[PDB]
Design an enzyme around this catalytic site. Structure first.
Site, mmCIF file in Angstrom:
data_model
loop_
_atom_site.group_PDB
_atom_site.id
_atom_site.type_symbol
_atom_site.label_atom_id
_atom_site.label_comp_id
_atom_site.label_asym_id
_atom_site.label_seq_id
_atom_site.Cartn_x
_atom_site.Cartn_y
_atom_site.Cartn_z
ATOM 1 N N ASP A 82 -5.603 4.298 1.463
ATOM 2 C CA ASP A 82 -4.597 4.165 0.418
ATOM 3 C C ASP A 82 -3.469 5.169 0.633
ATOM 4 O O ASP A 82 -3.591 6.338 0.260
ATOM 5 C CB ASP A 82 -5.254 4.406 -0.944
ATOM 6 C CG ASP A 82 -4.281 4.272 -2.104
ATOM 7 O OD1 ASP A 82 -3.159 3.776 -1.887
ATOM 8 O OD2 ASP A 82 -4.662 4.653 -3.237
ATOM 9 N N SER A 131 14.829 0.992 1.202
ATOM 10 C CA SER A 131 15.176 -0.228 1.902
ATOM 11 C C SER A 131 16.668 -0.512 1.740
ATOM 12 O O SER A 131 17.273 -0.203 0.712
ATOM 13 C CB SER A 131 14.331 -1.383 1.370
ATOM 14 O OG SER A 131 14.755 -2.632 1.885
#
Length: 330
Positions: free
Chosen positions: A35, A199
């Site tokens: 994770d 992004s």
């Protein structure tokens, strides 16, 4: 040193991925959920409340000759999906894919929430976010990667998650045969303890690319792709009959649909998520309403590039002095 381990989807939907981890001496092999959005290595154990264990493999520290109780240390964690666990702490030898760390903090669960109990395939979590998020008190502990880093050939790990198929976690090296083209690296902020990046935009299907900054986290422990409501609405508007259902808890779409791809930007590069990766199947057995793999982050407080996004790429988690993230197509 290096390590390399195969990671395997837990079910036919790729809801999560498990990776075998050797703990203790002799080794006890547990299948952990790696994770990159958390920083605790915790396991089902011989100390876990009996009624809360249902099929998981447990760690029994009393059977490990290298286990030592970390005196006074406790841990307690709550995840973004509302699940939680807590307990005490041992140090022990932990190996992943041939890479060994001695003195790793292994957090033994005394209690786990229902969602963990109900998932027989996940024996615990192995956190790969920054150690500043580790919950051990009163002395915070280091992640497996943080402990291994100085010994690694290069201070990196890579995630290569499969679509409906096994993939690979590598530590200490970049497998140049595992991706196509080049890896595009992008800046990381560690201010919130995550692999947080920005992004450069998105496209829906064959549509034009929208240049827009989307801050979010690379999180292997989250199943879906959570993005701003504007972006998510633009995606689902291209699927006839798709709608946001408050009762179901997100966007659903007719199972008869063909889903468009979704592209996200990494600098000037582009990662394309095929439409099929966005299908999470019937909302309930036999339903013709299917659950979408792109959902709104509104009210999460952060955008999350979970498995839906990451499995479309070869992803480098570069833990150099100034960390960065790399993405390649594959």
């Amino acid at each position: 040193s290096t390590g390399s381990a195969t990671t395997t989807p837990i079910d036919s939907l790729d809801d999560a991925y498990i990776t075998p981890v050797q703990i203790g001496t002799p080794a006890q092999t547990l299948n952990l959920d790696f994770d990159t959005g958390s920083s605790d290595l915790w396991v089902f154990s011989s100390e876990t409340t009996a009624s809360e264990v249902d099929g998981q493999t447990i760690y029994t520290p009393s059977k490990s000759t290298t286990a030592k109780l970390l005196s006074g240390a406790t841990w307690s964690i709550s995840y973004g999906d509302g699940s939680s666990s807590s307990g005490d702490v041992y140090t022990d030898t932990v190996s992943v894919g041939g890479l060994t760390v001695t003195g790793q903090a292994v957090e033994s669960a005394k209690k786990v929430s229902s969602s963990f109990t109900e998932d027989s395939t996940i024996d615990g979590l192995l956190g790969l976010a920054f150690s500043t998020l580790n919950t051990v008190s009163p002395t915070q502990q280091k992640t497996f990667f943080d402990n291994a880093k100085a010994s690694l050939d290069s201070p990196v790990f890579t995630a290569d998650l499969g679509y409906h198929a096994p993939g690979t976690y590598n530590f200490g090296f970049i497998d140049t045969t595992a991706y196509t083209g080049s890896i595009t690296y992008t800046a990381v902020s560690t201010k919130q303890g995550f692999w947080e990046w920005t992004s450069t935009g998105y496209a829906v299907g064959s549509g034009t690319f929208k240049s827009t900054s989307i801050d979010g986290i690379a999180d292997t422990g989250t199943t879906l792709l959570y993005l701003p409501a504007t972006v998510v609405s633009a995606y689902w508007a291209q699927v006839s009959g798709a709608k946001s259902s408050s009762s179901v808890g997100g966007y659903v779409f007719p199972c008869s649909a063909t889903l468009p791809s979704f592209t996200f930007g990494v600098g000037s590069a582009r990662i394309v998520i095929p439409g099929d990766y966005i299908d999470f199947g019937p909302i309930s057995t036999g339903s013709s309403s299917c659950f979408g793999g792109i959902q709104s982050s509104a009210g999460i407080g952060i955008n999350i590039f979970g498995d839906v996004a990451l499995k479309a790429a070869f992803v480098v988690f570069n833990g150099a002095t100034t960390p960065t993230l790399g993405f390649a197509s594959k």
